[PDB]
Design an enzyme around this catalytic site. Structure first.
Site, PDB file in Angstrom:
ATOM      1  N   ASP A   6       0.880  -1.163   0.000  1.00 25.82           N
ATOM      2  CA  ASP A   6       0.000   0.000   0.000  1.00 25.82           C
ATOM      3  C   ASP A   6       0.918   1.212   0.000  1.00 25.82           C
ATOM      4  O   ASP A   6       1.597   1.471   0.988  1.00 25.82           O
ATOM      5  CB  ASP A   6      -0.942  -0.055   1.226  1.00 25.82           C
ATOM      6  CG  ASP A   6      -1.672   1.248   1.489  1.00 25.82           C
ATOM      7  OD1 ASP A   6      -1.690   2.142   0.610  1.00 25.82           O
ATOM      8  OD2 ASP A   6      -2.277   1.359   2.583  1.00 25.82           O
ATOM      9  N   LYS A  68       1.967  11.669  -3.674  1.00 27.45           N
ATOM     10  CA  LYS A  68       0.971  10.866  -4.383  1.00 27.45           C
ATOM     11  C   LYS A  68      -0.063  11.755  -5.037  1.00 27.45           C
ATOM     12  O   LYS A  68      -0.698  11.356  -6.006  1.00 27.45           O
ATOM     13  CB  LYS A  68       0.288   9.897  -3.434  1.00 27.45           C
ATOM     14  CG  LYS A  68      -0.691   8.921  -4.080  1.00 27.45           C
ATOM     15  CD  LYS A  68      -1.185   7.938  -3.003  1.00 27.45           C
ATOM     16  CE  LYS A  68      -2.096   6.843  -3.548  1.00 27.45           C
ATOM     17  NZ  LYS A  68      -2.494   5.899  -2.448  1.00 27.45           N
ATOM     18  N   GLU A 169      -7.572   0.485  -4.166  1.00 29.38           N
ATOM     19  CA  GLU A 169      -7.550   0.441  -2.709  1.00 29.38           C
ATOM     20  C   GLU A 169      -8.851  -0.076  -2.069  1.00 29.38           C
ATOM     21  O   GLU A 169      -8.803  -0.970  -1.227  1.00 29.38           O
ATOM     22  CB  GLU A 169      -7.189   1.835  -2.179  1.00 29.38           C
ATOM     23  CG  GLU A 169      -5.697   2.101  -2.361  1.00 29.38           C
ATOM     24  CD  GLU A 169      -5.326   3.560  -2.273  1.00 29.38           C
ATOM     25  OE1 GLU A 169      -6.239   4.421  -2.322  1.00 29.38           O
ATOM     26  OE2 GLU A 169      -4.109   3.838  -2.144  1.00 29.38           O
ATOM     27  N   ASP A 191     -12.970   5.698   3.764  1.00 29.33           N
ATOM     28  CA  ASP A 191     -11.523   5.663   3.865  1.00 29.33           C
ATOM     29  C   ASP A 191     -10.932   7.021   4.238  1.00 29.33           C
ATOM     30  O   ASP A 191     -10.774   7.903   3.385  1.00 29.33           O
ATOM     31  CB  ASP A 191     -10.959   5.169   2.540  1.00 29.33           C
ATOM     32  CG  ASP A 191      -9.523   4.800   2.636  1.00 29.33           C
ATOM     33  OD1 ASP A 191      -8.829   5.385   3.500  1.00 29.33           O
ATOM     34  OD2 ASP A 191      -9.094   3.906   1.872  1.00 29.33           O
TER      35      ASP A 191
END
Ligand SMILES: Nc1ncnc2c1ncn2[C@@H]1O[C@H](COP(=O)(O)O)[C@@H](O)[C@H]1O
Length: 376
Positions: A6, A68, A169, A191
């Site tokens: 991850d 990211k 994800e 999330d």
């Protein structure tokens, strides 16, 4: 054997299939997650993970975090332009049009910064495996386009990993919860991580996931909760002692760490003590910071951040064409979901108690490793 990584906005996690059970791998420091942070000091030495996180406030110009947000994206992407206004480090337009970062006059692609983090996760796995790791499955947000996926793959390649697959994800998280073997059902994946908020509505059909809708806020994460509390601490301290900590980056470094620590304690305790000895110095001598913080106080401080998760969720359900009733299960992803008030907001949102069965910040890596095991 194929590792599952991850590669997260704020933190990363590596796991691997061991038996019929995946196992999250601890790094040399004993940590089950590693900060997705890369820094270059005045020396020009490169710091990755926790050593980098530890100096992010004292070295803001040359500490890269949340890259990211940049990976796979043109400089002129609105989200990159929004990023520029939110982070203190230099974002530049590469010759090829892409968003890169700069430090000490050196240029790095987001794939390079990712590769530094992945090399650390690769070492962590090898340190457990006892042999070199080559094959990997890496996760990305569901909304990533091919360009962002390809850049993530390139990050893995730079690190010496063969990325067999990139998977989403929320799907990885769903695998970790075993929804793989569930009867057909609609799933909400809520999330809230260190750097971004995602809400995905998935459907399990005959064991295969489909993403019916996606939403969230890429600029809403645990870091903002830490900052809101640090802001409170700084104001309270100034009133208490007269000293303004905003002038001392080292004190702020210590306060930001203490604020994150305080937030995590308040998930299991209703009060916590913030203690920072010799935080600053006065014409009277050393000054020590000592503050009690209650969970009610903390909740008040971050209530707007939590509420920002509401509208994105309602929209996701509307876009997936379901009512709360049609949702069979809510799974929690991201360390922030450990906060009681966040769990309550999720419950109010979906009309059911969310599932806490899997580690919130390890679910994605676990899913990655499961998919890895299949591929192998
Ligand atoms: N026990 C906890 N209570 C509150 N927040 C936490 C806890 N554990 C982790 N977090 C936060 O969750 C975020 C990590 O999520 P992730 O980026 O998914 O690893 C960080 O911002 C942490 O501060």
């Amino acid at each position: 054997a194929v590792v599952g990584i991850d590669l997260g906005t704020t933190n990363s996690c590596v796991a691997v299939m061991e038996g019929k059970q995946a196992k999250v791998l601890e790094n040399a420091e004993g940590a089950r997650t590693t900060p997705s942070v890369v820094a270059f000091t005045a020396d020009g030495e490169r710091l990755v993970g926790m050593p980098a996180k530890r100096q992010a406030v004292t070295n803001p110009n040359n500490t890269f975090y949340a890259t990211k947000r940049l990976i796979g994206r043109r400089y002129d992407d609105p989200e990159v332009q929004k990023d520029i206004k939110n982070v203190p480090f230099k974002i530049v337009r590469a010759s090829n049009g892409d968003a890169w970062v700069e430090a000490h006059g050196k240029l790095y692609s987001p794939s390079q910064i990712g590769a530094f983090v992945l090399m650390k996760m690769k070492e962590t796995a090898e340190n457990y495996l006892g042999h070199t790791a080559k094959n990997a499955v890496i996760t990305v947000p569901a909304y990533f386009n091919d360009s962002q996926r390809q850049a993530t793959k390139d990050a893995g390649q730079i690190s010496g990993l063969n990325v067999l697959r990139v998977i989403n994800e929320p799907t990885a998280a769903a695998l970790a919860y075993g929804l793989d073997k569930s009867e057909d059902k609609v799933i909400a994946v809520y999330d809230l991580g260190g750097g971004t908020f995602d809400i995905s509505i998935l459907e399990i059909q005959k064991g295969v996931f489909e993403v019916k809708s996606t939403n969230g806020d890429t600029f809403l994460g645990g870091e903002d909760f830490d900052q809101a509390l640090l802001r409170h601490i700084v104001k309270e301290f100034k009133r208490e002692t007269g000293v303004d900590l905003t002038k001392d980056n080292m004190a702020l470094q210590r306060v930001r760490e203490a604020a994150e620590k305080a937030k995590c304690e308040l998930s299991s305790s209703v009060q916590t003590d913030i203690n920072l000895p010799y935080l600053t110095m006065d014409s009277s001598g050393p000054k020590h910071l000592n503050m009690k913080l209650t969970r009610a106080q903390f909740e008040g401080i971050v209530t707007d951040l939590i509420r920002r998760t509401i509208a994105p969720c309602q929209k996701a359900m509307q876009d997936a064409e379901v009512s709360k009733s049609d949702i069979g299960e809510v799974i929690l992803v991201g360390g922030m979901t450990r906060m009681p008030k966040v769990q309550q907001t999720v419950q109010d949102l979906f009309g059911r108690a969310p599932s806490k069965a899997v580690n919130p910040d390890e679910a994605v890596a676990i899913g990655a490793a499961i998919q890895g095991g299949v591929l192998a």
